[PDB]
Each structure stands twice: as C-alpha cells, then as structure tokens.
Symmetry: C3
Subunit: 329 residues, 3 copies
C-alpha cells in the first residue's frame, strides 16, 4: 500500500483531501503532540486544558473507508500526565486506548483500519476517573472517514460539498472560589478535586465551540457565499447538543454521523449524542449573518455554544421580504 503523510490544520478548518478517493486504499500517516496548557474560555474564565495538538477540539483527520490510519502520538516531557487515544472509528483494544498509553516523554505509533464510514470522535481515556476528566479538559477531536465514492444522499446520488468546517463542541466544569469567581490553577492536577465537584453536578459552566466562547465569532466567524454547499461536522465527546442554523436548515443530516445511513432532510435542528460526531450539509440561499447554535439557547448564549457564519451573495426576495418596515401603530 501507498503511504500518504498529512499536515493537520487546526479547527475549524480541514487538511487537504479528496471527497471521492483519488487512489485505492492507502496508509494515512498523522502525527500529533499532546499539549497541556491553561486556555482562556471566556473574559473571566480559564481551563487547565489537555489537548491533542494544542487545539480544542483536536484537529480533523480525513481518510477514506478501508484506508488505514497510522498515528504517532507524542506526549512531550513538560506534560504532567499519562495520556492515550481512543478512536471511535477503530475496532479493538478500547479504540486504541489499550495500546497507546504514554508517559510524559514517550511516543507510540498505532495503526488501525478505517473499516467504517462516518465522522467519529477520538478522545483520550487513560483509565477510570481519568477518562471523564481528560475529555472535559478538551482532549477530544474528530476523524472523518469518507466513503471511497464520496457522499451519497437518501436515494444514493452523489452529493458534493464545497467547504467543510469542523465544529467541536465541548462542555467544561470550571470550579469557583468562595467569592463566586472562577478559580485558576498552576497545573491540571491542582484543579482536579474542585473540578470533580462541579462535574458531579452535571451542570457545565461553559459549553463552547472551537475551545472558547466566541471562538467562531468576530475574527473567527465562518464564511461562505450563496450557492456554497457546506458540510458542518459537529462533535461532542461527553454531552448532548442540538445544533441549529439560524436562518438556514440542514439539507441533508446524518445526526448519528455515519454516511452509509440514509440522511434526513429539511431539518430545523438536529441532535448530537454525547460521545459522537454528526454531519449536516446546507447549500446557502441567502446572504447575510447566520448563527450556528446549540438550541438550548441558555447553552448557546449563557454557556458559549454560538458560532457565526457570514455569507455573501445576492438576496432573494422570493424566499423572504420585509413587506412593511417597522412602523408606528
């Protein structure tokens, strides 16, 4: 088999790829470096993060069904924790968790066959209580396994996207000092017991896209043009989400994320099961600002789960028109 090396791009973007496989099965080589660091979630709020390649989420990997994935995972010596990786895309050894546990200052190389098409979470899962703590510290990402013959719709005809954005949603449990302010810590372990108490309540303090409140707004706002077919791949490794495109729809949605399943059409809001990634296509019809949200609007607005899409193009009054502008009674 040919081998193909890849250079990962941080989310929400995607490394280069073909939808329809150019070749026969290949071996896909990726490398990631584990990075522990405090990140800023919001104006007043920080997280002792544990990341794949410095990002929340970890970067998107793309391959085709029946390729192999061979990943060099590196845990640099300044890190304080063992770490590993579980690919939900993979068969055996706890998704690879059982074969990839590395200490600060080790590497490991795992190969699995991508026997199943879909977008799949991958996350760290060291063992027992370390499993939820590491995930809720940001250590999760997504791999997308495209059918060899590109995407097909509900009746088997090819559909093609012009753009893919990877939206990684994550819940976090930032504990608070006696004064009601979020706590800062020097390292993750110092934060461990107080994070646990928050985690036990199952109420996230933040729920964010691409690692921070507003990360996908302002300078981070996603971009498209009328007529673009955009694929929105959305992961949530630990808790449910109900993605909605305000002003738009899901044209084709695989909310359970697996491309050989029939997608649903015309959805207003769909459902991402915690522990999973889903995918929705939408072809933009109208220019202007859109917002992509978790539709528990408390989660979208008070917790952080809002992204913006800026869309240029010609407006169509047939689809919508302000007939009479805001006027006195």
């Amino acid at each position: 088999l040919p081998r193909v090396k890849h250079t990962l791009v941080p989310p929400p973007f995607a490394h280069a790829h073909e939808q329809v496989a150019a070749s026969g099965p290949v071996i896909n080589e990726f490398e990631m470096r584990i990075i522990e660091k405090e990140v800023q979630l919001d104006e007043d709020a920080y997280l002792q993060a544990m990341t794949f390649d410095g990002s929340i989420p970890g970067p998107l990997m793309i391959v085709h069904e029946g390729d192999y994935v061979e990943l060099t995972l590196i845990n640099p010596p300044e890190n304080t924790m063992p770490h590993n990786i579980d690919f939900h895309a993979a068969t055996g050894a706890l998704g690879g968790g059982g074969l990839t546990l590395i200490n600060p200052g080790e590497k490991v190389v795992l190969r699995f066959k991508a026997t199943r098409a879909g977008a799949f979470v991958y996350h760290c899962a060291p063992g027992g209580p370390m499993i939820p703590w590491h995930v809720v510290s940001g250590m999760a990402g997504c791999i997308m396994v495209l059918p060899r013959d590109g995407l097909k719709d509900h009746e088997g005809k090819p559909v093609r996207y012009d753009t893919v954005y990877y939206i990684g949603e994550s819940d976090h449990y930032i504990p608070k000092d006696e004064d009601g302010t979020y706590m800062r810590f020097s390292d993750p372990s110092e934060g461990y017991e107080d994070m646990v108490a928050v985690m036990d309540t199952l109420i996230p303090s933040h729920i964010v896209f691409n690692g921070a409140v507003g990360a996908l707004t302002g300078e981070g706002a996603l971009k498209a043009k009328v007529g673009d077919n955009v694929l929105f791949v959305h992961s949530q490794p630990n808790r449910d989400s109900r993605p909605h495109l305000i002003g738009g729809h899901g044209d084709l949605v695989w909310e359970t994320g697996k491309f050989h399943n029939a997608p649903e059409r015309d959805l207003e809001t769909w459902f991402i099961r915690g522990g999973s990634a889903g995918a929705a296509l939408y072809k933009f019809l109208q220019p202007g600002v859109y917002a992509y949200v978790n539709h528990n609007l408390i989660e979208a607005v008070h917790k952080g789960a809002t992204a913006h899409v800026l869309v240029e193009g010609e407006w169509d009054n047939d689809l919508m028109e302000q007939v009479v502008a805001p006027v006195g009674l």
Copy 2:
C-alpha cells in the same frame, strides 16, 4: 397568487385547514399581537410571560409547502420590550428575526416562502441574552407546513388525521425568595436578574404543556373516540422532551418533525430536540383515560409535563383483559 386570511385559534386547537391543498400556492396572511403579562404556572407559581397572541405556546399556523406566509406582527404600546420573530420554517435574515424587530407601539409585515414541509418552531429572538430569556418567558409557537398532497407514510401512501392537537412544551426558570417560595414581579425586567441565576443552573422549575401545570387536564383534557387518527404536534423551543402516550403508541412518528422524511412506526416514546417540533399520529383502539407525558417522569409529574386524553368507544378485550381481578393471596 390568491391571498387567504386566517383567524388563529389558541392551542391546543388548530385554525381551519385542508390536509391536501385545495388550490395552487397561495399567500397566507396571519396577524399576531405580542402580549406581556404575568401568567399562573401552578398553584403557587407565576411567570412574567412574553407571548405571541396571549398564549403559551403561541398559536399554530398551518400552510402548504410552497405557499407564502405573510405575518403582521404587532407589539402594543403597553409592552416594555422590543420583540421579533424567527420562523425555523423560513430561509434568510435569521429566520426573519433580522427584519422583524419592533419596539412597543410598532408593527412589521414579513413575508417568507414555506419551501419546506414539517412542523417548525417559531420564537422571539431579540439579540444576545435577550434570546434565551424571551423564549423561556413563553415566546415560542409552531408553524406546520403540510406537503401539498397531504401526509404520506414510510412507503409513500396517504395517511389522514381526523384531529390535530398542538402540544407546546416549555421549560421555565422561576426564581425563589429567601423562604423557598417562588417570587412574583411587577414586570419582566424586574425579574430578569433572578431568573438568569436559575437559567444558569439549567434546571427548570416547571415544564408545562399549553402554558401551565394541568392546562391539558380536567376541563382542558384532550378528547377523542376509538377509531380517530390523531396528529400530536409537539414543540419545545429550548430543551429536549421524550413524549409518550400512556396506553398508546406512536403509529407514525416524525420525531425530527419534517414530513418528507420516512416516519418510524410503533414507537413507545419519541424525542423532541430542544429547538424543534415533532409530530406523531396515533389511531385510538381503546376507550378510557390516556396521559401524554414527557417520559422523564419527574418532569411529567413534579415539573408539569402531563396532558390527559379522554377517549370514548367500545373496549376490545382481545387487546387487553383483566383476567383475574385484584384478589387476596
């Protein structure tokens, strides 16, 4: 195009309509008036509500796929807030939110084309933090866009309902005084900061059908007869629900709510994604009292999410029979 004016009926009922379109595409004219008022949720519990037409939920609008909807929205001068409307049925301008923001004492007229069949939430969404607050104050409703050729089942054959009921479920976050009693306020704004703290916990104090605990029980109990095919359209603008008909089933269920998708059959309980409306048909087989619930039974019973259906007709012992009555051991 012909224009058709409609007189809205408050939920759970529906204004008059045809399932199969009588005509070609038409323009559907609706008008609603925004009403802010304290409503009573339960014996000891009140809400500073913000409503479309005085009801929680806002009334059901019905049209056919490819019609237009032209809505006059009015915000009377005694109201204290700007308000707007986002139709999830609509394409562009944040579902119409961006073109319908009106101050107390203004109106606006929005037209959109109903290009997509299904039941869809519509809700107020003024901007930022006002978005979740206004929704959780009751400002949401549903529009149903029926395929031109009526409803079809999993294999494309026509199915027809004899009755539709619109069940609008809403979560609310009523804050409490120091003594553990729910607070009352003079206006919504006075309640804003204390409601926010409750909202941040993501735990609703109430979760109600048609605006109040027991609203669809007693005098409000829904009604049918053995042999009636009833469509139960169920909205939840902000939080998930898991509707179940006790004693019954969903014969055909579009839990994501969009009629061109294949429905599922024989369901015991289905799932309404927060931010969405779904629909289930059931043809009654047995007379007697049924309960329609959110099947987190804590939500159904402690929070308010229970409705009753009273069904008359002949009992069938073949389906169920008490073989031996309650007798001593």
Copy 3:
C-alpha cells in the same frame, strides 16, 4: 391457543426462547413477585428499592409479535405500598396500569396482545407522584417482542444473534445527611420526602447498569467470543442514555427499539430515550476487554454507568496493530 409457561431469569440474562417463532400465536404466561428491599448501589450508598422479582431492572420477558402475555403479578404482604404495572408493549388502560393496582397481599392477572414488535419498557406507575418515585426506586424492566420471523436488517434480510444481554440502566436520587453522606432509611416511605428534594434537581446521584455500580463488571462482566453476534437490549425508564461500546460499534441499531423500523449501521454511540428501550447488534471482531458505557463519561464513571465485556478469540492485526510500542522521545 397454546399456553406456554416461562421461568424468568434475572438480568442481564434471558429466559429461553426462539428467535423465529416455532409455532403460531401462543399465550405466554409469566409470574412476578414485587419485592421491596434496601439494595446496595455503591460502597457507601444504598437505595430503598421497589422491584419486579427482586432485581433492578426487572427481568426480561420475550414473546413474538401477535402472541399474548398473561402476567400474574403478586404484591407479598410484607410490602408497604400498592403497586401496578404499565407495559409500554400494550394497548389500553394506561398500559395495564389501570387494571393491575394491587395492595400488599393481593394478586392480579392481566392479559394483553403483543401487537407490536420491539423492546419496550414496563414499569410501575401507581398514580400521580407515586409514578416517578416508584420508577426511580427500580421498578422497571423490559419486555421484548420479536417479529414472528426473527430480526431483519435495513434491507429485509434475516439477522440472527448468538447471545442477548439485557442491560437495564436506572437513575437514582439518593439523598444525603447534613455531613454529605448518603442517608439510609428503614423503609421506602421514610425516605420519600428527602428523595423528592434530590429528584427535583434532576441530577441523579447514581446511574447504574443491572442495579449497582460495577454490577456488570468483575464477576458480573459480560462474556463473548470473536465471531459472536450479540444483541444488547438497553432500557432507561426515566432519563436519556447514550450507549457506546468502547472498541466496538453498533452494527445494526434500532435506538428507538422497534424492529420493524430500519436500523442504522456503523454507529459509534446511540441514544436511548428516557421512557424507552433500544437494541443494538454487534458481531465481535477482536478479543480483549471492552466497556459498554453511557457516553456522558461523568455518568459512566462518576455515576455508575459502566459495564465490561470480556471477549476471547484470535487477534487481527489488520484491524489494529501497535506499530511502535511506548518508547522515549
């Protein structure tokens, strides 16, 4: 019609049955005894349980679509509560609830026709507030109604399992003494008011498989061999779950649980709606330890929702291989 008597086996196992019906419609006789008892949920944590046959969940009953089910339900005189049973599999009388309410020291015999294929919750539901309390005390179980002609896949071809395990997930609301320790009580009623306060927060203290933390680990660990097609039937009577097989997938999944619906394939995680039971088949490919979890990993690890599967067989390096073992940088 023939009558067939059954001897129930406690979960996670299943009484003997045929997948494809041996005979024409029959009458299935079952008997269960209600048992109230304190059970141990975790090292430091007990529940005033109310059970069908002494187990959480109550045992799995299996029949074929169009059979009848005739159940003798017995409430022994040492119990302190009335109790009843609602089969979600059943049509009329609140799933049988309305015809089966028995006092301590009575029995009742209910017959219903199993007109609908799928796995269905059955639970106690005495009336009003007793409904959620009795369920969250463990009184729920599952009945599985197999199509007469066995299971079929997405395109109608027969699929056959070698093993079925019934995984019953339950949320519990164990209140705590002033010192932060879980309370013990002498009887359920003594615990009623303090459990209620916990229930009102909607945050479970425990969320367990087969009635206790670790119940399906260690000596309880599920077992299979490479090449076994295992059916995992998973119930949750009151709250949602997101089952995931770590190291595996759902080959065919009916997450809403009803076998005449098309299953989805290749799922990483699926969704069990509170108030329902779902089913997933998986044919093991790799030997070793797997974990079956609720993929809110806080729920899986901090709350109790983890089971283990121990699988023997030959390892396949084509599916996965540790290319380079854990080595220094």
